[PDB]
Scaffold this motif. Structure first.
Motif, PDB file in Angstrom:
ATOM      1  N   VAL A 209       0.811  -1.213   0.000  1.00 12.91           N
ATOM      2  CA  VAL A 209       0.000   0.000   0.000  1.00 12.91           C
ATOM      3  C   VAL A 209       0.850   1.271   0.000  1.00 12.91           C
ATOM      4  O   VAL A 209       0.758   2.093  -0.912  1.00 12.91           O
ATOM      5  N   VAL A 210       1.689   1.422   1.016  1.00 13.37           N
ATOM      6  CA  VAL A 210       2.520   2.613   1.136  1.00 13.37           C
ATOM      7  C   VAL A 210       3.587   2.808   0.062  1.00 13.37           C
ATOM      8  O   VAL A 210       3.546   3.786  -0.685  1.00 13.37           O
ATOM      9  N   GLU A 211       4.546   1.891  -0.013  1.00 17.70           N
ATOM     10  CA  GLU A 211       5.626   2.006  -0.988  1.00 17.70           C
ATOM     11  C   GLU A 211       5.178   1.906  -2.443  1.00 17.70           C
ATOM     12  O   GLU A 211       5.748   2.558  -3.319  1.00 17.70           O
ATOM     13  N   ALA A 212       4.151   1.104  -2.699  1.00 12.84           N
ATOM     14  CA  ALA A 212       3.633   0.957  -4.054  1.00 12.84           C
ATOM     15  C   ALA A 212       2.707   2.129  -4.372  1.00 12.84           C
ATOM     16  O   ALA A 212       2.226   2.263  -5.500  1.00 12.84           O
ATOM     17  N   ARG A 213       2.464   2.969  -3.366  1.00 19.95           N
ATOM     18  CA  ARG A 213       1.599   4.140  -3.500  1.00 19.95           C
ATOM     19  C   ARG A 213       0.238   3.799  -4.096  1.00 19.95           C
ATOM     20  O   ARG A 213      -0.256   4.494  -4.992  1.00 19.95           O
ATOM     21  N   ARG A 214      -0.369   2.726  -3.600  1.00 22.60           N
ATOM     22  CA  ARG A 214      -1.681   2.316  -4.078  1.00 22.60           C
ATOM     23  C   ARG A 214      -2.792   3.161  -3.471  1.00 22.60           C
ATOM     24  O   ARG A 214      -2.991   3.167  -2.252  1.00 22.60           O
ATOM     25  N   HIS A 215      -3.511   3.879  -4.327  1.00 22.29           N
ATOM     26  CA  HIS A 215      -4.634   4.691  -3.879  1.00 22.29           C
ATOM     27  C   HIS A 215      -5.868   3.792  -3.864  1.00 22.29           C
ATOM     28  O   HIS A 215      -5.787   2.615  -4.238  1.00 22.29           O
ATOM     29  N   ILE A 216      -7.007   4.329  -3.446  1.00 22.80           N
ATOM     30  CA  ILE A 216      -8.205   3.510  -3.356  1.00 22.80           C
ATOM     31  C   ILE A 216      -8.611   2.823  -4.668  1.00 22.80           C
ATOM     32  O   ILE A 216      -8.986   1.648  -4.652  1.00 22.80           O
ATOM     33  N   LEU A 217      -8.516   3.510  -5.804  1.00 28.23           N
ATOM     34  CA  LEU A 217      -8.879   2.854  -7.061  1.00 28.23           C
ATOM     35  C   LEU A 217      -7.947   1.678  -7.344  1.00 28.23           C
ATOM     36  O   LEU A 217      -8.395   0.613  -7.768  1.00 28.23           O
ATOM     37  N   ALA A 218      -6.652   1.866  -7.105  1.00 30.55           N
ATOM     38  CA  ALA A 218      -5.683   0.799  -7.340  1.00 30.55           C
ATOM     39  C   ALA A 218      -6.000  -0.432  -6.494  1.00 30.55           C
ATOM     40  O   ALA A 218      -5.855  -1.566  -6.952  1.00 30.55           O
ATOM     41  N   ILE A 219      -6.426  -0.215  -5.253  1.00 33.13           N
ATOM     42  CA  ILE A 219      -6.761  -1.329  -4.374  1.00 33.13           C
ATOM     43  C   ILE A 219      -8.014  -2.039  -4.881  1.00 33.13           C
ATOM     44  O   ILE A 219      -8.073  -3.271  -4.894  1.00 33.13           O
ATOM     45  N   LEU A 220      -9.007  -1.265  -5.315  1.00 30.56           N
ATOM     46  CA  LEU A 220     -10.241  -1.834  -5.846  1.00 30.56           C
ATOM     47  C   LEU A 220      -9.952  -2.632  -7.120  1.00 30.56           C
ATOM     48  O   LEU A 220     -10.590  -3.651  -7.378  1.00 30.56           O
TER      49      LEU A 220
ATOM     50  N   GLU B 190       4.038  13.948 -10.766  1.00 32.63           N
ATOM     51  CA  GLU B 190       3.566  12.886 -11.653  1.00 32.63           C
ATOM     52  C   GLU B 190       4.676  11.843 -11.712  1.00 32.63           C
ATOM     53  O   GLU B 190       5.812  12.161 -12.053  1.00 32.63           O
ATOM     54  N   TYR B 191       4.346  10.601 -11.382  1.00 35.95           N
ATOM     55  CA  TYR B 191       5.348   9.541 -11.367  1.00 35.95           C
ATOM     56  C   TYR B 191       4.750   8.161 -11.579  1.00 35.95           C
ATOM     57  O   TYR B 191       3.564   7.941 -11.340  1.00 35.95           O
ATOM     58  N   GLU B 192       5.587   7.228 -12.019  1.00 34.71           N
ATOM     59  CA  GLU B 192       5.145   5.859 -12.231  1.00 34.71           C
ATOM     60  C   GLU B 192       5.378   5.104 -10.927  1.00 34.71           C
ATOM     61  O   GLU B 192       6.445   5.210 -10.325  1.00 34.71           O
ATOM     62  N   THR B 193       4.375   4.353 -10.485  1.00 31.77           N
ATOM     63  CA  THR B 193       4.491   3.604  -9.239  1.00 31.77           C
ATOM     64  C   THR B 193       5.146   2.250  -9.456  1.00 31.77           C
ATOM     65  O   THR B 193       5.331   1.809 -10.590  1.00 31.77           O
ATOM     66  N   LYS B 194       5.493   1.595  -8.354  1.00 36.20           N
ATOM     67  CA  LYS B 194       6.113   0.281  -8.408  1.00 36.20           C
ATOM     68  C   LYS B 194       5.036  -0.764  -8.668  1.00 36.20           C
ATOM     69  O   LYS B 194       5.266  -1.964  -8.516  1.00 36.20           O
TER      70      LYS B 194
END
Ligand code: FAD
Ligand code: NAP
Length: 433
Positions: free
Chosen positions: A178-189, A235-239
């Motif tokens: 969640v934290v390091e991968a910077r997963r926001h609510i949509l990403a989790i869903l 603006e950045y690409e997440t892991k």
């Protein structure tokens, strides 16, 4: 849960909140005084790219505050209430299978509580997700704990419960997933497709969307009716293979002055203690690499204006820094002109990536140790703006060394010397992370 849902299927449009932070209809019917609860919707008259390269996007905006009666001084901060990306809001509504245009109110089950609602109500889910809720930062463990019950696939429910727990492995998974991968609510869903929480409960769980602050980059002596902002877009690409966008900076980047229709930004001014010397004859030393140069553009505009008026103005020195002169040298044109005209006594710029090694503002400060000591002993004011993680500390330590060396005193005495400058208001900081 804390709130109960009351759907308003037949409500008058005039009673529905559309993004206002305070009083209903305050955004549309603007009456002073304007402040945090009643922000002024400033028209964006200019929105232009400052950097030469394309690695990042650095921008300069000018917000029209004419008729607002708002007062400000160089050094102050301007706060803005942003809006989330409409496409992101749309994706959330779709994955949840919710009708975002439903107007409703979430009312505290504790009828006596001062907190009647989680955000302005009545309002639609679309409006809440756009203006009132944080849907871009990593959800806290408590949110995951409450959401787990809504994941029908056992393995996914287990994953969510684990990351929300205090187990050793659970904490490590939350940190990385969640934290390091910077997963926001949509990403989790999206990554836990069986997760189908009711939208109203989700709106009760998410944090509020916060005001974002910027250092005003203009002088009110020159631009009394305009507040300028200098900002770098996030603006950045997440892991996790996604592209994350900073809310306020991408919202601002999309503000086209412009069919007609003015681009409006709800804002207010927060007074700071960062100020030019009372006497124009007092010298100033400004250190602000990157966007940290922001307040100094206003300082220099002001000092230039004073000289133009015919007033005597002391030395004005700027220590700026960027990666490459042809990549991200902010206000290169304006600064060159101020220097040529004498408004800027010295324009010292550290290009950190034009050679194999790093060249930073503190390197230039040390090389100018003699003159800087002379200025400091003479009563000059020092200002540092920008990165508070390392730059601010590195610069402070450099001034320690300068004073210790040229002041012919011990480090300890140098530290006390600088600390006294701070108490006397001659060493000011405006740093952020
Ligand atoms: C007093 C004050 C003055 C300021 N003045 C200015 C100014 O003049 N100019 C300016 O540009 N900014 C300034 N800032 C920073 C500004 O307020 C915002 O934090 C910034 O613009 C980002 O906001 P955002 O809404 O676009 O990002 P948000 O949506 O709030 O997201 C920011 C978060 O994204 C994450 N993040 C950012 N980059 C990455 C990355 N590469 N990888 C992983 N995570 C990342 C971090 O967790 C960060 O906290 C100031 C802050 C303060 C407190
Ligand atoms: O705006 P922004 O945040 O996006 O700024 P930024 O571009 O990240 O940085 C502004 C300038 O500050 C330099 N810098 C980095 N760490 C520093 C430090 N500890 N001390 C002094 N200068 C430093 C950068 O060099 P580098 O990015 O090349 O390290 C760059 O030239």
């Amino acid at each position: 849960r804390q709130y109960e849902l009351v759907v308003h299927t037949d409500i008058d449009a005039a009673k529905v909140y559309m993004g206002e932070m305070g009083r209903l209809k305050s955004y549309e019917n603007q009456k002073p005084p304007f402040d945090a609860k009643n922000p002024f919707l400033a028209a964006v008259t200019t929105n232009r790219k400052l950097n030469q390269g394309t690695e990042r996007h650095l921008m300069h905006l000018e917000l029209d505050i004419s008729d607002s009666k708002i007062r400000y001084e160089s050094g102050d901060h301007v706060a803005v209430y942003p809006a989330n990306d409409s496409a992101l809001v749309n994706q959330l509504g779709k994955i949840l299978g919710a009708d975002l245009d439903v107007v409703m109110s979430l009312n505290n089950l504790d009828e006596e509580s001062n907190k009647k609602h989680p955000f302005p109500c009545p309002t639609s889910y679309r409006t809440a997700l756009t203006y009132y809720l944080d849907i871009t930062n990593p959800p806290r463990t408590n949110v995951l704990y409450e959401l787990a019950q809504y994941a029908s696939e056992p393995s996914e429910q287990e994953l969510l419960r684990k990351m929300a727990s205090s187990s050793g492995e659970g904490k490590e998974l939350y940190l990385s997933w969640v934290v390091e991968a910077r997963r926001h609510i949509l990403a989790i869903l999206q990554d836990c497709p069986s997760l189908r929480p009711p939208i109203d409960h989700l709106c009760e769980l998410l944090p509020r969307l916060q005001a974002h602050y910027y250092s005003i980059a203009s002088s009110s002596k020159v631009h009394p009716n305009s507040v300028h902002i200098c900002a770098v877009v996030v603006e950045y690409e997440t892991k996790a293979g996604r592209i994350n966008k900073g809310v306020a900076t991408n919202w601002l980047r999309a503000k086209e002055p412009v069919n007609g229709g003015r681009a409006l930004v709800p804002m207010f001014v927060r007074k700071s203690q960062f100020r030019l010397p009372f006497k124009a004859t007092t010298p100033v030393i400004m250190v602000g690499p990157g966007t940290g140069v922001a307040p100094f553009i206003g300082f220099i505009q002001e000092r230039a204006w004073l000289r133009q008026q015919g007033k005597e103005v002391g030395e004005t020195l700027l220590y700026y820094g960027c990666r490459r002169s042809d990549e991200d040298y902010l206000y290169r044109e304006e600064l060159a002109q101020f220097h040529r005209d004498g408004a800027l006594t010295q324009l010292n710029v550290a290009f950190s990536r034009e050679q194999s090694h790093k060249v930073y503002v503190q390197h230039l400060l040390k090389q100018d140790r003699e003159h800087l000591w002379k200025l400091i002993e003479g009563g000059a004011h020092i200002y540092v703006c920008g990165d508070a993680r390392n730059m601010a500390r590195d610069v402070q330590n450099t001034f320690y060394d300068i004073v210790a060396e040229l002041g012919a005193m011990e480090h300890a005495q140098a530290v006390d010397y600088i600390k006294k400058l701070m108490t006397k208001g001659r060493y000011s900081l405006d740093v952020w992370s």
